[PDB]
Write an enzyme that holds these catalytic residues in place. Structure first.
Site, PDB file in Angstrom:
ATOM      1  CB  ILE A  71      91.522  28.055  -4.237  1.00 50.15           C
ATOM      2  CG1 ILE A  71      92.726  28.829  -4.091  1.00 50.15           C
ATOM      3  CG2 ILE A  71      91.716  26.710  -3.730  1.00 50.15           C
ATOM      4  CD1 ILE A  71      93.255  29.202  -2.690  1.00 50.15           C
ATOM      5  CD  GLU A 160      90.648  38.065  -3.335  1.00 54.42           C
ATOM      6  OE1 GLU A 160      89.435  37.864  -3.183  1.00 54.42           O
ATOM      7  OE2 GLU A 160      90.767  39.041  -4.478  1.00 54.42           O
ATOM      8  NE  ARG A 163      90.971  36.910  -8.304  1.00 56.06           N
ATOM      9  CZ  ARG A 163      90.150  36.316  -7.498  1.00 56.06           C
ATOM     10  NH1 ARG A 163      89.646  36.851  -6.313  1.00 56.06           N
ATOM     11  NH2 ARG A 163      89.531  35.150  -7.840  1.00 56.06           N
TER      12      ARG A 163
HETATM   13  C1  LIG Z   1      81.762  32.467  -6.999  1.00 55.15           C
HETATM   14  N1  LIG Z   1      83.265  32.191  -6.587  1.00 55.15           N
HETATM   15  C2  LIG Z   1      84.251  33.154  -6.208  1.00 55.15           C
HETATM   16  N2  LIG Z   1      85.307  32.471  -5.636  1.00 55.15           N
HETATM   17  C3  LIG Z   1      86.633  33.088  -5.179  1.00 55.15           C
HETATM   18  O1  LIG Z   1      86.764  33.059  -3.734  1.00 55.15           O
HETATM   19  C4  LIG Z   1      86.598  34.066  -3.133  1.00 55.15           C
HETATM   20  C5  LIG Z   1      85.392  33.867  -2.408  1.00 55.15           C
HETATM   21  O2  LIG Z   1      83.975  33.849  -3.088  1.00 55.15           O
HETATM   22  P1  LIG Z   1      83.025  34.592  -3.136  1.00 55.15           P
HETATM   23  O3  LIG Z   1      82.108  34.363  -4.026  1.00 55.15           O
HETATM   24  O4  LIG Z   1      82.572  35.164  -1.698  1.00 55.15           O
HETATM   25  O5  LIG Z   1      83.739  36.001  -3.902  1.00 55.15           O
HETATM   26  P2  LIG Z   1      83.517  37.834  -3.732  1.00 55.15           P
HETATM   27  O6  LIG Z   1      82.172  37.909  -3.281  1.00 55.15           O
HETATM   28  O7  LIG Z   1      84.790  38.186  -3.424  1.00 55.15           O
HETATM   29  O8  LIG Z   1      83.184  37.947  -5.541  1.00 55.15           O
HETATM   30  P3  LIG Z   1      84.313  38.426  -6.791  1.00 55.15           P
HETATM   31  O9  LIG Z   1      84.465  39.915  -6.493  1.00 55.15           O
HETATM   32  O10 LIG Z   1      83.174  38.428  -7.859  1.00 55.15           O
HETATM   33  O11 LIG Z   1      85.407  37.542  -6.878  1.00 55.15           O
HETATM   34  C6  LIG Z   1      86.104  35.027  -4.205  1.00 55.15           C
HETATM   35  O12 LIG Z   1      86.695  36.317  -3.746  1.00 55.15           O
HETATM   36  C7  LIG Z   1      86.896  34.624  -5.522  1.00 55.15           C
HETATM   37  O13 LIG Z   1      88.318  34.756  -4.971  1.00 55.15           O
HETATM   38  C8  LIG Z   1      85.173  31.160  -5.719  1.00 55.15           C
HETATM   39  N3  LIG Z   1      85.772  29.970  -5.423  1.00 55.15           N
HETATM   40  C9  LIG Z   1      85.412  28.787  -5.793  1.00 55.15           C
HETATM   41  N4  LIG Z   1      86.402  27.817  -5.148  1.00 55.15           N
HETATM   42  N5  LIG Z   1      84.323  28.615  -6.046  1.00 55.15           N
HETATM   43  C10 LIG Z   1      83.604  29.531  -6.381  1.00 55.15           C
HETATM   44  O14 LIG Z   1      82.036  28.973  -6.826  1.00 55.15           O
HETATM   45  C11 LIG Z   1      83.813  31.006  -6.285  1.00 55.15           C
END
Ligand SMILES: C[n+]1cn([C@@H]2O[C@H](COP(=O)(O)OP(=O)(O)OP(=O)(O)O)[C@@H](O)[C@H]2O)c2nc(N)[nH]c(=O)c21
Ligand SMILES: *[C@@H]1O[C@H](CO)[C@@H](O[C@@H]2O[C@H](CO)[C@@H](O)[C@H](O)[C@H]2NC(C)=O)[C@H](O)[C@H]1NC(C)=O
Length: 246
Positions: A71, A160, A163
C-alpha cells in the site's frame, strides 16, 4: 479499480473482493501454478486503486503497487496521505493528483515502524471486517497514531489476504467479530518474501527449496517448508513477489 463495501458485507462478498484484488494484479507467467507478479510497471499503471466503503458508506481510495501489493497511500475526501518512503513519494506523482493537500505520514510502510507508531504489535491488534470498518473510519480524519493501527488492519485484511488463501479465510471467520491474527497468520505475512523467493529458486532445483522456510501451521505448530509439494505452496500462497524485487 476494485471495490469493497462493508455495508451488507459477508464472508462471500469479502471473498469476491479478494478475488477481484488478485485479478487486478498483472502477471505474464505462473510459477508452480502461482501468478508471478511483474518485475516492474511504468507510469500510473503501477498502481491499483481500491475503493473501500465503511458501514455508513463513507469511503477511502487506497493506492496499491501491483508489483508487490504494497500500500502506498490513500485518499480521504480531498486529502491524500502517503507513507514516508521514496516508493510512496514516487507513487504520489501518479495518484490522487487532484487532492487539495497531500500529507506525508510520519512513518514508512513496514510492520515494525507501524507497530511502534501504533503502540502495539499486531499480535495484539484485532482484525476482521468490523476492524476494517473501524480502520476506514479512522483514516477518514487524520490522526497519525490511530492511522498506524488502522493501516496495520487495512494491510492485513487486503494485501495479506490477497497473498494467502489461509489469511483470506481467517478474515472471513472474523466477518462479524474481530480477533487477533493467528500465529500462522503472522508467520505467513512474515514469510511471503522468503516463500516467493524459494518457490522461484525451486524452478531449477527440482522443486526443492535452496533454503527451508520455517512457519507456524494452523494448529499453531512450527513446521519446516522444504519443497513445492507443501500445502503452503499448492493451496495457500496466491501471488509471488518477483525475485528481481528481493
Ligand atoms: C518493504 N515493504 C514491505 N511492505 C508491505 O507492508 C507490510 C509491512 O512491511 P514489512 O517490510 O514489515 O513486511 P514483511 O516483514 O512482512 O516482509 P515481506 O514478507 O517481505 O513482505 C509488508 O508485510 C508488505 O505487506 C511495504 N509497504 C510499503 N508501503 N513500503 C515498503 O517499503 C514495504
Ligand atoms: C517435500 O515436502 C514434503 C511435505 O509436503 C515432505 O514430506 C514431509 O516430511 C516428513 C516425512 O518425510 C513428514 O514429517 C511430513 O508428514 C511429510 N509430509 C507429507 C505431506 O508427506 C518431503 O520430505 C519433502 N521432500 C524433500 C525432498 O525435502
Amino acid at each position: 479499480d476494485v471495490s469493497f463495501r462493508l455495508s451488507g458485507a459477508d464472508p462471500s462478498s469479502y471473498g469476491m473482493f479478494i478475488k477481484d484484488l488478485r485479478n487486478a494484479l498483472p502477471h505474464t507467467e505462473k510459477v508452480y501454478n502461482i501468478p508471478l507478479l511483474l518485475p516492474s510497471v511504468s507510469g500510473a499503471g503501477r498502481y491499483l486503486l481500491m475503493h473501500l466503503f465503511n458501514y455508513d458508506g463513507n469511503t477511502i481510495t487506497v493506492a496499491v503497487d501491483v508489483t508487490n501489493v504494497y500500500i502506498m497511500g490513500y485518499l480521504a475526501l480531498t486529502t491524500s496521505y502517503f507513507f514516508n518512503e521514496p516508493a510512496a513519494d514516487l507513487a504520489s506523482q501518479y495518484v490522487f493528483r487532484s487532492a487539495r493537500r497531500k500529507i506525508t505520514l510520519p512513518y514508512s510502510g513496514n510492520y515494525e515502524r507501524l507497530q511502534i507508531a501504533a503502540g502495539k504489535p499486531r499480535e495484539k491488534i484485532p482484525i476482521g471486517l468490523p476492524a476494517l470498518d473501524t480502520a476506514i473510519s479512522t483514516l477518514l480524519h487524520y490522526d497519525s497514531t490511530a492511522a498506524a493501527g488502522a493501516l496495520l488492519v487495512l494491510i492485513q485484511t487486503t494485501a495479506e489476504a490477497a497473498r494467502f488463501k489461509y489469511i483470506e479465510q481467517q478474515i472471513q471467520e472474523r466477518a462479524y467479530r474481530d480477533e487477533v491474527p493467528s500465529s500462522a497468520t503472522i508467520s505467513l505475512e512474515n514469510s511471503w518474501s522468503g516463500l516467493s523467493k524459494q518457490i522461484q529458486l525451486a524452478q531449477g532445483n527440482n522443486g526443492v527449496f535452496r533454503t527451508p522456510t520455517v512457519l507456524v501451521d494452523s494448529k499453531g505448530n512450527r513446521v519446516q517448508i522444504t519443497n513445492v509439494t507443501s500445502n503452503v505452496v499448492t493451496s495457500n500462497i496466491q501471488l509471488l513477489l518477483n525475485t528481481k524485487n528481493i
